[PDB]
Amino acid sequence: GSRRFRFXPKIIFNQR
Numbered sequence: 001g002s003r004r005f006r007f008x009p010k011i012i013f014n015q016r
Helices: none
Strands: 005-007 010-012
Touching: none
Parallel strands: none
Antiparallel strands: 005 010
């Protein structure tokens, strides 16, 4: 989605 939107214990990139 929005490149690498990794947020510590959270992970928002799995689905790009």
